[PDB]
Amino acid sequence: MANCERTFIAIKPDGVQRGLVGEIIKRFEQKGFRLVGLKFMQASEDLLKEHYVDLKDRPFFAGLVKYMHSGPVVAMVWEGLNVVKTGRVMLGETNPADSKPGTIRGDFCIQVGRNIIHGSDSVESAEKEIGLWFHPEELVDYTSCAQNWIYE
Amino acid sequence: MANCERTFIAIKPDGVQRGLVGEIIKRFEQKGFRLVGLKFMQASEDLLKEHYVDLKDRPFFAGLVKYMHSGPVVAMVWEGLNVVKTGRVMLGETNPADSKPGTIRGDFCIQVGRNIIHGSDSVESAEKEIGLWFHPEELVDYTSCAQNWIYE
Amino acid sequence: MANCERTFIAIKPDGVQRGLVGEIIKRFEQKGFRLVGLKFMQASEDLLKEHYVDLKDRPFFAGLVKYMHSGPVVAMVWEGLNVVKTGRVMLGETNPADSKPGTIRGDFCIQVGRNIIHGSDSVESAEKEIGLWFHPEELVDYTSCAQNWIYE
Amino acid sequence: SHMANCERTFIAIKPDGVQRGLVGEIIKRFEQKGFRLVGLKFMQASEDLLKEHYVDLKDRPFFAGLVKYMHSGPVVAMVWEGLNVVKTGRVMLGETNPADSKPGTIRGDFCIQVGRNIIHGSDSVESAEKEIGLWFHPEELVDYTSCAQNWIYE
Amino acid sequence: MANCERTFIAIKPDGVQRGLVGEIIKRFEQKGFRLVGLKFMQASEDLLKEHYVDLKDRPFFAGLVKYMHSGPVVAMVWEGLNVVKTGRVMLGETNPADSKPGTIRGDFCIQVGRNIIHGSDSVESAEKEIGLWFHPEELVDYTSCAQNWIYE
Amino acid sequence: SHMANCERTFIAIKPDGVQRGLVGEIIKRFEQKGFRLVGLKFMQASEDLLKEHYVDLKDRPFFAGLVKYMHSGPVVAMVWEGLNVVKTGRVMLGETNPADSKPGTIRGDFCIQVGRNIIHGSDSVESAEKEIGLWFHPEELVDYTSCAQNWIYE
């Protein structure tokens, strides 16, 4: 089902440190997307190495894993029609310098090395990231009281 | 006369149901546009059919009219320089998927059939829509205390 | 029947002029109260004299009526459990100096003669005020999609 | 770091709070205040967990309905840390009955009826210890130092 | 003139550091109070010793002066009816633990040693504090476009 | 600290921005973004200062009206610091003509006409150097380290 598409959203250590957890969740709630998974955690080096597995031979890999391990993250799963693509639009460009005002990165951060947030770039990546960060039983299913007013 | 241009804005039944009336009015107030007409109403079938005359031969027409009738709407008239054009920009693209963050549809909705809001697409359409939804006596004329700081 | 209690709320000419219409409506929406009636209007002298009948022999009466006539008002009807009592709490004390931060008057105004807003002081007053400002056909009945999550 | 500034409380967003889209707003209020996030999870509370949580109310006539309702929808379970989090957290939430809750508080701004009061907070430090231990495993609690700590506490 | 009463408001180093300058000014603007003085500065030890002159023989004096000198402050003057007393209400109790939700300290800080903000406790103190922190020519006089809608 | 992250820009809230109560909102947007406050003052700009600021437009037919208007009301003069503040500051402000400004930007959200466009920002680093030196004395610029610096810049 197209309306039941899901994406992985992670608030990075700098997003948590700068007090942006509430603001970010509010953006997704007000949009009409439904929360399915939410977790406050410190990501282990093993998990981060698997998450950034495509970049393991790149020279910035050690510093990237170290930084994402240096503070707690907020791992999330959101559900909705085209939530992967729309979620990325809501976040803005990965490089905050190119992010537009009104987007999460556009409003709240400056440098790409400290870009507060991550979102799945595709449905394929979403399935991989959700399975890696979340256990199946940590994902909650329910129907929003506003479902009929959000979707036809 | 250019600063006295008027447009019709309607908050659709899903906009009312999802509690977005105040948020939407705030957007137009803070911009500097002047409120002219405002009423909470259930639109009759005859009114809606006349409002969507250009779409009467479309396959969606019957369901579209029935839905706009399914719940109460907030009918509005706003005044300002290029209020028709800039009003549409503030609302965002008709399809919420193409609507940018910062716009009303971009921030608050997902699906085209549940796109919370309507705005006149032209000056000609605005004049027709205002006269259709509002009696002349319902439109209030006053001068904003900030007029000299909004316009030269 | 207790959850179906109704109150009259009016945004005064200074509330409209200072761009507080959206902010005020948002306060009632987010609380969980249901919009029943809403209209933008210039109140006639006859209507205002009847609205302030209990104050007709007061020295301020003439200037008070003239001022409420000097600019357009937003007349509203809201529905909910103890909406009359809690509505007054949300508005704050009649004198803004005694109004607490968090209330409408406490946050947004200074002087008693320019106190942005009116709310019915009793159920009896509410019924009189609603019938005075609104025709029965202008009051819209619908069920909020969140009704079961606001009330038992 | 002073031990007094490291007090913990349990805050839970109820099913109606989740349904009405208040999760982000509630978290924001604790964040902007200066309190630090320790635990956070999205969950459907099991009947066993709810029976143990409302153990003092087991003999009451509406106990069956209370457990059933709190099980009907998902909740957001949270642990927050700060100087007197328990006491001031209750102040931020407002009175349990929303009719007596003041504007500016969470219940005062966002809900109407006591049966649908969107949120819960520990009434005491003793209750906080019990509630955190019941709802969270020790591994789920994350300890970190806020970059603003020196500007929140002397 | 009662409407021309003025008070001194200072955002403390922790208020600046925690990014609250904008939020605080917004509170006073939306209330209807008029900005007359605004300055970003690092307060010298000489100025702080004179500001806290009544406490110079107390054992906490050295630490208090040192802290208020450790970071930049935002010094402000605001004008309005009973702005001194009302300003203090808007700030909330000096000890944030006793500050109510909706007030500046109630919403944004925790401990009295880091209470983000200061406001004059009396008209007498206001005159003394404004004269100490500001030069007469740094105070700007103008009339708000909304004056007639804020005051009778 | 990297020199690149220490770029400075001049931002001025115009008399209409002050009149319409947008001072707090504008400052908030720069604060929440992560940019650091360097200079801030409330002032009525003198005719001499405005003539030097708009020196490139001195021969234009509406120069007399422009100086007169900018002198009629008080302004908020600001200096902000951060990585590419000049460029991104302009993006945050939106297009000079508010008709072309996008929602989410300062001009896009809050104003309508080009003659009353509430705000100004330096168009280049060269302009920033000139504008800061003209509007501010070196003593008025305050240097401090943000507690969040390590979480804004690597």
Curated annotation (Swiss-Prot), chains D, F:
How is expression of this protein distributed across tissues?
Isoform 1 is expressed in heart, brain, placenta, lung, liver, skeletal muscle, pancreas, spleen and thymus. Expressed in lung carcinoma cell lines but not in normal lung tissues. Isoform 2 is ubiquitously expressed and its expression is also related to tumor differentiation.
Instruction: State what inhibits or activates this protein.
Output: Autophosphorylation at His-120 increases serine/threonine protein kinase activity of the enzyme. Interaction with the SET complex inhibits the endonuclease activity.
Looking at the UniProt record for this protein, which Gene Ontology cellular component terms does it annotate, in alphabetical order? cytoplasm; cytosol; early endosome; extracellular exosome; membrane; nucleus; ruffle membrane
The residues responsible for catalysis, as annotated, are H120 (pros-phosphohistidine intermediate)
Q: Does the keyword Magnesium apply?
A: yes
- Cofactor dependence: Mg(2+)
**What SUPFAM superfamilies does the database record attribute to this sequence?**
Nucleoside diphosphate kinase, NDK (SSF54919)
**List of residues binding ATP:** K14, F62, R90, T96, R107, N117
- Its chief place of residence is cytoplasm
The subcellular localization recorded is: Cytoplasm; Nucleus
Q: Subunit arrangement?
A: Hexamer of two different chains: A and B (A6, A5B, A4B2, A3B3, A2B4, AB5, B6). Interacts with PRUNE1. Component of the SET complex, composed of at least ANP32A, APEX1, HMGB2, NME1, SET and TREX1. Within this complex, interacts directly with SET. Also interacts with TREX1, but only following translocation to the nucleus.
Q: What else is known?
A: The role of this protein in tumor development and progression is uncertain. This protein is found in reduced amount in some tumor cells of high metastatic potential. However, increased NME1 levels correlate with aggressive tumor features in neuroblastoma. May have distinct if not opposite roles in different tumors.
Its biological purpose is as follows: Major role in the synthesis of nucleoside triphosphates other than ATP. The ATP gamma phosphate is transferred to the NDP beta phosphate via a ping-pong mechanism, using a phosphorylated active-site intermediate. Possesses nucleoside-diphosphate kinase, serine/threonine-specific protein kinase, geranyl and farnesyl pyrophosphate kinase, histidine protein kinase and 3'-5' exonuclease activities. Involved in cell proliferation, differentiation and development, signal transduction, G protein-coupled receptor endocytosis, and gene expression.
Q: Which family does it belong to?
A: Belongs to the NDK family.
Q: In its UniProt entry, what is this protein called? A: Nucleoside diphosphate kinase A
What is the species of this protein? Homo sapiens (Human)
